[PDB]
Amino acid sequence: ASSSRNGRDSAAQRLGVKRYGGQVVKAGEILVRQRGTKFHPGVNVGRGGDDTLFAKTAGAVEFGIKRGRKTVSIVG
Amino acid sequence: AEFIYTMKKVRKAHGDKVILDDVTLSFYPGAKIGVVGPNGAGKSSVLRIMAGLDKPNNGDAFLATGATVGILQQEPPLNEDKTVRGNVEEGMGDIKIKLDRFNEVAELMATDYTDELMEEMGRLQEELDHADAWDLDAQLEQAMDALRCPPADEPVTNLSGGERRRVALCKLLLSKPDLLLLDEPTNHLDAESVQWLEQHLASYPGAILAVTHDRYFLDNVAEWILELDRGRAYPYEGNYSTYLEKKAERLAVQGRKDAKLQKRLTEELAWVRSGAKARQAKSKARLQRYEEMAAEAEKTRKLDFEEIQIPVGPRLGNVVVEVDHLDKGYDGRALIKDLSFSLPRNGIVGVIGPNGVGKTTLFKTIVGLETPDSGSVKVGETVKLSYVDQARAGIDPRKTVWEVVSDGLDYIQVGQTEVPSRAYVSAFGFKGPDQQKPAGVLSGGERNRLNLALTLKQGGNLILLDEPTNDLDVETLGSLENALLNFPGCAVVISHDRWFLDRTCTHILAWEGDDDNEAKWFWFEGNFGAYEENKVERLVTHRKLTR
Amino acid sequence: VRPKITLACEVCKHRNYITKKNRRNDPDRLELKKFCPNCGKHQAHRETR
RNA sequence: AAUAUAUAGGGUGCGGGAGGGAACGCGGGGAAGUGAAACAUCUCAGUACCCGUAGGAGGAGAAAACAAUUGUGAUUCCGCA
RNA sequence: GCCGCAGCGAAAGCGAGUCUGAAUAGGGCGACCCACACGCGCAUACGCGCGUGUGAAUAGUGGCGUGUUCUGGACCCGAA
RNA sequence: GGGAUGAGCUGUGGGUAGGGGUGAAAGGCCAAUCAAACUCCGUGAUAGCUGGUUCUCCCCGAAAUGCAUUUAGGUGCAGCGUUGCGUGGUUCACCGCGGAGGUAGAGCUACUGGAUGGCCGAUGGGUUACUGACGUCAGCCAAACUCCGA
RNA sequence: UACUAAAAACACAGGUCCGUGCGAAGUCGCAAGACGAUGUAUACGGACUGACGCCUGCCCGGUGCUGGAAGGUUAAGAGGACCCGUUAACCCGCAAGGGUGAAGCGGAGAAUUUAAGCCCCAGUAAACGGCGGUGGUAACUAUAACCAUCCUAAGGUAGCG
RNA sequence: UCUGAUCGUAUUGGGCAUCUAACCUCGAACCCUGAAUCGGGUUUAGGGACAGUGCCUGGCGGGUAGUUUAACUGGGGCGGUUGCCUCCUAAAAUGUAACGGAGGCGCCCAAAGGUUCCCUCAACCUGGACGGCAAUCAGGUGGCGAGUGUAAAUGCACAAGGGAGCUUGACUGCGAGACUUACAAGUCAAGCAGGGACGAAAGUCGGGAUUAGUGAUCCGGCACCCCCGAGUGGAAGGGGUG
RNA sequence: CGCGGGGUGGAGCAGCCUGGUAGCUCGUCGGGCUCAUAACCCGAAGGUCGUCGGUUCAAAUCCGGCCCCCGCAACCA
RNA sequence: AACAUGU
Numbered sequence A: 001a002s003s004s005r006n007g008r009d010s011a012a013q014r015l016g017v018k019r020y021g022g023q024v025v026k027a028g029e030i031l032v033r034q035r036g037t038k039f040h041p042g043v044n045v046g047r048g049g050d051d052t053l054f055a056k057t058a059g060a061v062e063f064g065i066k067r068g069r070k071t072v073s074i075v076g
Numbered sequence B: 001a002e003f004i005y006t007m008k009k010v011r012k013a014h015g016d017k018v019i020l021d022d023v024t025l026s027f028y029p030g031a032k033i034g035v036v037g038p039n040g041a042g043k044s045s046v047l048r049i050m051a052g053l054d055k056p057n058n059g060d061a062f063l064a065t066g067a068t069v070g071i072l073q074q075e076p077p078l079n080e081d082k083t084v085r086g087n088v089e090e091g092m093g094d095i096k097i098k099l100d101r102f103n104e105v106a107e108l109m110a111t112d113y114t115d116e117l118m119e120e121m122g123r124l125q126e127e128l129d130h131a132d133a134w135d136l137d138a139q140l141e142q143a144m145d146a147l148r149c150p151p152a153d154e155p156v157t158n159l160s161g162g163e164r165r166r167v168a169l170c171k172l173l174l175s176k177p178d179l180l181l182l183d184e185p186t187n188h189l190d191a192e193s194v195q196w197l198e199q200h201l202a203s204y205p206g207a208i209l210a211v212t213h214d215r216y217f218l219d220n221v222a223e224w225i226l227e228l229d230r231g232r233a234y235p236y237e238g239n240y241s242t243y244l245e246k247k248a249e250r251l252a253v254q255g256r257k258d259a260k261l262q263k264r265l266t267e268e269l270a271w272v273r274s275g276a277k278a279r280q281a282k283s284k285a286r287l288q289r290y291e292e293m294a295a296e297a298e299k300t301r302k303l304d305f306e307e308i309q310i311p312v313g314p315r316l317g318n319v320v321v322e323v324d325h326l327d328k329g330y331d332g333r334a335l336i337k338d339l340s341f342s343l344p345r346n347g348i349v350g351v352i353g354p355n356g357v358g359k360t361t362l363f364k365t366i367v368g369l370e371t372p373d374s375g376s377v378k379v380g381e382t383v384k385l386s387y388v389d390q391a392r393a394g395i396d397p398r399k400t401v402w403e404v405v406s407d408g409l410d411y412i413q414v415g416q417t418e419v420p421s422r423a424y425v426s427a428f429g430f431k432g433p434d435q436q437k438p439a440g441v442l443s444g445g446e447r448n449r450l451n452l453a454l455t456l457k458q459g460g461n462l463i464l465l466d467e468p469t470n471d472l473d474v475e476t477l478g479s480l481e482n483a484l485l486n487f488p489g490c491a492v493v494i495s496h497d498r499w500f501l502d503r504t505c506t507h508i509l510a511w512e513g514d515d516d517n518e519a520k521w522f523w524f525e526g527n528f529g530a531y532e533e534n535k536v537e538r539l540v541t542h543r544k545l546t547r
Numbered sequence C: 001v002r003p004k005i006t007l008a009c010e011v012c013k014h015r016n017y018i019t020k021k022n023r024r025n026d027p028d029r030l031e032l033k034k035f036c037p038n039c040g041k042h043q044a045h046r047e048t049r
Numbered sequence D: 001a002a003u004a005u006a007u008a009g010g011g012u013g014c015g016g017g018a019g020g021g022a023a024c025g026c027g028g029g030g031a032a033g034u035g036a037a038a039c040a041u042c043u044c045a046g047u048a049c050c051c052g053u054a055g056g057a058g059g060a061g062a063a064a065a066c067a068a069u070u071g072u073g074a075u076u077c078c079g080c081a
Numbered sequence E: 001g002c003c004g005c006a007g008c009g010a011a012a013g014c015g016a017g018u019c020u021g022a023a024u025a026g027g028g029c030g031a032c033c034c035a036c037a038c039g040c041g042c043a044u045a046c047g048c049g050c051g052u053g054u055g056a057a058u059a060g061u062g063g064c065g066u067g068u069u070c071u072g073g074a075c076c077c078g079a080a
Numbered sequence F: 001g002g003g004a005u006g007a008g009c010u011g012u013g014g015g016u017a018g019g020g021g022u023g024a025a026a027g028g029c030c031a032a033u034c035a036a037a038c039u040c041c042g043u044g045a046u047a048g049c050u051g052g053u054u055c056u057c058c059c060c061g062a063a064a065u066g067c068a069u070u071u072a073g074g075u076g077c078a079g080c081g082u083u084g085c086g087u088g089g090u091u092c093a094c095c096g097c098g099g100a101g102g103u104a105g106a107g108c109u110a111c112u113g114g115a116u117g118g119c120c121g122a123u124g125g126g127u128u129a130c131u132g133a134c135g136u137c138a139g140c141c142a143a144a145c146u147c148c149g150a
Numbered sequence G: 001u002a003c004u005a006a007a008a009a010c011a012c013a014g015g016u017c018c019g020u021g022c023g024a025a026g027u028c029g030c031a032a033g034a035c036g037a038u039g040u041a042u043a044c045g046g047a048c049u050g051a052c053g054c055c056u057g058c059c060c061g062g063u064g065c066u067g068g069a070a071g072g073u074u075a076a077g078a079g080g081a082c083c084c085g086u087u088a089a090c091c092c093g094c095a096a097g098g099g100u101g102a103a104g105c106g107g108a109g110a111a112u113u114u115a116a117g118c119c120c121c122a123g124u125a126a127a128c129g130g131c132g133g134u135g136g137u138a139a140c141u142a143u144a145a146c147c148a149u150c151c152u153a154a155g156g157u158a159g160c161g
Numbered sequence H: 001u002c003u004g005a006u007c008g009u010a011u012u013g014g015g016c017a018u019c020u021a022a023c024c025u026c027g028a029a030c031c032c033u034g035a036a037u038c039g040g041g042u043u044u045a046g047g048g049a050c051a052g053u054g055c056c057u058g059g060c061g062g063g064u065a066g067u068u069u070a071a072c073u074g075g076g077g078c079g080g081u082u083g084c085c086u087c088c089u090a091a092a093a094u095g096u097a098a099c100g101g102a103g104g105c106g107c108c109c110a111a112a113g114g115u116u117c118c119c120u121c122a123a124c125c126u127g128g129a130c131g132g133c134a135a136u137c138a139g140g141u142g143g144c145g146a147g148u149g150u151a152a153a154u155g156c157a158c159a160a161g162g163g164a165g166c167u168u169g170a171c172u173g174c175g176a177g178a179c180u181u182a183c184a185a186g187u188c189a190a191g192c193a194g195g196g197a198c199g200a201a202a203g204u205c206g207g208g209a210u211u212a213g214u215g216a217u218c219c220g221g222c223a224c225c226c227c228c229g230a231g232u233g234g235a236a237g238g239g240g241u242g
Numbered sequence I: 001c002g003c004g005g006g007g008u009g010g011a012g013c014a015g016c017c018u019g020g021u022a023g024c025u026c027g028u029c030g031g032g033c034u035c036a037u038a039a040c041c042c043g044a045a046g047g048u049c050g051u052c053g054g055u056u057c058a059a060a061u062c063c064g065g066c067c068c069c070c071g072c073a074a075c076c077a
Numbered sequence J: 001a002a003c004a005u006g007u
């Protein structure tokens, strides 16, 4: 009956990419919810407090590389 | 009998250290209360509530209508004007500008319109007959000759330590408030001025509260005695010989009640680890009583007392201090004239004198911070001193108490040995997270205790102490004089505590000046009790201060 | 050790903000320069007692 | 009567009360199961039961009342609010 | 008497608006007909504002039914 | 088989009443019933538990999961069923294009650890026949290793 | 233990301790009353052992019971400073307001005064209860009469196993 | 007439002692009473403002009464666990269970927050007073192997890491639109206005590199706004915002 | 196996949740007293705090990881 | 009042 002290865990935070590329968004939608800057803000995209990569302008989402760092941009 | 001050359900606490908890008491006029208690009890925090400076956390600690309040802080402030201008800022505070307005209108109303300014020189003149301020000049000239103040036209920077308390007692005793708040009034005063303040506070219309650590000023000025324990206040009557009985009795019954509570735990802790047997269960009621008895055994840890431990210096030689025909003076006044002595080895020299006679200037010629006018001081190659002034650097009011003893360092040199700084300040009482208290929030019993930590880390074999018996209670005052007898060097002590120099002294240097000389001293080979006997073989009306 | 303090304006004495200090690091009162909605301009705020 | 005034008690003559009844009325005493998904405040309910006492009905009833500053004008009971 | 007849607001109150607010800022809740010519600073055409309609499309309440619900023993039988 | 002149056995009449009686003490006995009798009444007590619930055809047709719970054999909301009124191809399948991934696999002188055998040899141990670090040449392993990667 | 238990259980005579000074203590009763008992500390009641014989050791820290009353703490009642509400009057005034406010009636009420109890100081174990660890040491070995130390209110004696 | 002492009358409470008349007497005698160990009355002998009883109040109180005393669980008990953050289990979106495998949290910081400007680390190698494997210095080499207030992951050398100047945006009034989600909650947000900080400007700032450091509703406390004010003016109490 | 104490100089124990400076008694060793040994008096030496891996400036203490010693639970059929 | 011992 060696009761292990190894049972607890935390609730899943629903992270990941929430709008994909070539997809029409509205102004202010959340594109990528994440810890840290796994994806970086490109053009017309702002970061936020907990690195949430919102939208500044309606348009089409496109992803790309900008000097090693993978970015998220919006083509108006 | 209408009161002066009342407290209702007052609770003031600095987090974990409570000062009051649900206190309620009233102060009626004609009370003579002397408030006692050890260091850290909260005596100077209660008097700052009653002065209107601080405010309690909850409860209602208010004042009677009218009934102005004057407080003497434990380190009293002064202005930067003259001594005659130092007394007019309290006692003659609001009434001098009525006098500075009535002489203004004595020429302004003549050259201007005489109908609105007619009553403006009228209601001033109605505030000069019930307060009797027509002779305000000679009311100052009496209140300086009662406390025997320094003269009128000198700055208040180059004064004594006791002359800065004589000029601060004259401020409050001119106001005549309905509630005095004296925080240690007999510090730095001689035997003449404390005997004055005993007979003055006898006949005094109004409540007097006075926190004192000595035992002979209190029995002449106080008939009721208030105490501050860990939060609680215990009022009763007596004469401080019954305070030390009842304080030592509360700890007697508490010691053999916490001990009986301790054996109830070990009989109960053995039950909670005994392991549940067959299908009968261990009762959750008894688990809950043990978890509430373990908590009341933790809010009782009160034993924390470390002896003052002076570090020994190197081996001391035969010449400690030689003085040959010393003269010292700042003006045409002479303080020291034709003085020759030689400090011994492995003794205690007590220095005796009334206020403003040159005891502290005598130390500053030995350490070299002053210069003799004629004659020399000679030290000797084995002597390493230990001395810190009260005024040139002292303490810094926003550095913490750990970085005043240290300078931000981990280990310090107390004289050819390595000790940790936090193990050094904890040897001087400052234990736990109290080592981050800045110097402004330290009390008087732990500013005198901090000042011993700065002087004694220099590791000397000739320590010079200027009034170490200042704001210390009887528990650590006996602990200091224990360590001056186990000290293998020479210690020189300036004091006014007559029953501290009677206990640990071997040599007496005393001012025996009279009318024709006023600057001669005297060296005596022996203790203070035998100096009083030798004094009479070689060889008063109370001044009123008011009307 | 970190109590909650309320900051009051030094002109109109409204209690506009609540915050936390450290009682061992800041034994004295906190003076900041915050925005009072009564006065309409940034003014000196200080703790209560 | 004890005991004096007298009263308690006693004598004689007249009148009255007691007990029953299915419900309704008035005044007093007063549960628990149950509901709260446990339970104590609370509810069930001043219910069940009990005690006193009636009447053909009973109780209440002629303002030390309401009102809002204009007005209604003893109580009971039904409808609303 | 009830429900419908105008809402907003904690409420004084104001009212096709009203509350928050310093706000001719934004919101919350609520009112508010082009598929139709003309008149209409107008506009390439299309609408805006505003008369006449092309005489626009609304609506509540009471009875009796049915489904579920509420207070009652509440679909019926059964404890210690 | 035990008592059988005794703290005996028995007759007739009487007293003790339910949280009370009585008990030479077993929770015994108190009308074949006793860890609180029997009978009427509150009363059709209550039961998240068990049993039962009656005539027919026609269309559609589940769930045993999520979250919460004095909760886990119960229940509330969702999920999935049916039906009225709205919306009208917005669902799903396939092909073409635009997107993020770090499993399977593989790799490790690309990191953190494991780790076989040679070569060099810091130290440690008895001038050094034992220990073999760090480097280095070949061969390897990993859910909490990844320069890669379906 | 009527109806699965007749015993080692209960009773008992003997022992001790505590309570009771007399319509007693104890018990049945809301009370009056009654039992106790037409008894009176050699009597009556409550507890625990159980003829008899030899005995009944140490512990008053804990929890009870008995006594004490120095000190702390502590209820209602008594007391009713001050503070607050209202307003006759007065003051600045726009008499659109603001300020000061007697007497009265009310609201909330502090100091002070005050018993038992509890904390406290003692006694009590035929009151409920409790009666220790680790290491060394003697003619071969073995065991320690003996010693060291820590602790407790005190460390299980006689006898038995 | 004040502060203090003292005397004296009137008054009013608290102790103590004495009294008798309330009250008490299962002490006695006599009477109703013919028959009465009940009861009442009369006189006597004692007690006595105490005791008893009422109303208010503190203590004590298993003597009695009503009840509570959780769940998960490889049956139950015993042992363990219960909310929040991070990783593996998790099968390349999200999500996913077990008494599966590892750790944390119930804080801290008045700068360790904001802004402008500047800088690059650890390790190794050579030289050097005390100086050693390693303090501080000088020069090479070094692209992230150091560092991050705090666990772990995702990140960060353009730094979010190391240093300095000034400061309080650790704001008030709002917030189109989204992520998550049974509900309740939880999370992000450009931008507009007031009033500020920093910067020459462009601009950035509604606390911290990110995600833990916490608690619904009811009932209350406090400051402020003057919203209702049970006949009217007030007030009590309620109401709003913090 | 499961709980929960414990390991400190040759022997016995403090210190430990209240982190900084390792202590108390006996014993051992050298010197005294005595005719000599005891007893007594004086001066000294002696410990990786069971081992090793984490925070802190600093660990016997705070936290993990293993190795022995002691105590207690293993009940209902 | 101290005071045990002697192949």
Ligand SMILES: Nc1ncnc2c1ncn2[C@@H]1O[C@H](COP(=O)(O)OP(=O)(O)NP(=O)(O)O)[C@@H](O)[C@H]1O
Binding pocket: B158, B159, B160, B161, B162, B163, B188, B330, B353, B354, B355, B356, B357, B358, B359, B360, B361, B362
């Ligand atoms: N710098 C100075 N210039 C002039 N006079 C001075 C100075 N310092 C001290 N004095 C005077 O010298 C006298 C004695 O000085 P001081 O030695 O301080 O006396 P003291 O002993 O300290 N008095 P106290 O210690 O309170 O009992 C006093 O009159 C002072 O005012």
Ligand SMILES: Nc1ncnc2c1ncn2[C@@H]1O[C@H](COP(=O)(O)OP(=O)(O)NP(=O)(O)O)[C@@H](O)[C@H]1O
Binding pocket: B014, B017, B037, B038, B039, B040, B041, B042, B043, B044, B045, B046, B074, B441, B442, B443, B444, B445, B446, B471, B472, C027, C028
């Ligand atoms: N502002 C403060 N913040 C935190 N702690 C404080 C503060 N003020 C005081 N203290 C603490 O509370 C204590 C109270 O001081 P206090 O005891 O009143 O002085 P004191 O009694 O006069 N000392 P003493 O004069 O020697 O008797 C101090 O010693 C500090 O330890």
Ligand SMILES: [Mg+2]
Binding pocket: A010, A011, A012, A013
């Ligand atoms: Mg996760």
Ligand SMILES: [Mg+2]
Binding pocket: A049
């Ligand atoms: Mg944040």
Ligand SMILES: [Mg+2]
Binding pocket: B043, B044, B074, B183, B184, B211, B443, B444, B445
């Ligand atoms: Mg003081």
Ligand SMILES: [Mg+2]
Binding pocket: B160, B161, B162, B359, B360, B466
């Ligand atoms: Mg001086």
Ligand SMILES: [Mg+2]
Binding pocket: C025
């Ligand atoms: Mg600071």
Ligand SMILES: [Mg+2]
Binding pocket: none
């Ligand atoms: Mg009748």
Ligand SMILES: [Mg+2]
Binding pocket: none
């Ligand atoms: Mg009930």
Ligand SMILES: [Mg+2]
Binding pocket: D036
């Ligand atoms: Mg219920």
Ligand SMILES: [Mg+2]
Binding pocket: D037
């Ligand atoms: Mg139920």
Ligand SMILES: [Mg+2]
Binding pocket: none
């Ligand atoms: Mg009638």
Ligand SMILES: [Mg+2]
Binding pocket: none
């Ligand atoms: Mg409405």
Ligand SMILES: [Mg+2]
Binding pocket: none
């Ligand atoms: Mg609007």
Ligand SMILES: [Mg+2]
Binding pocket: none
């Ligand atoms: Mg037979």
Ligand SMILES: [Mg+2]
Binding pocket: none
């Ligand atoms: Mg036979």
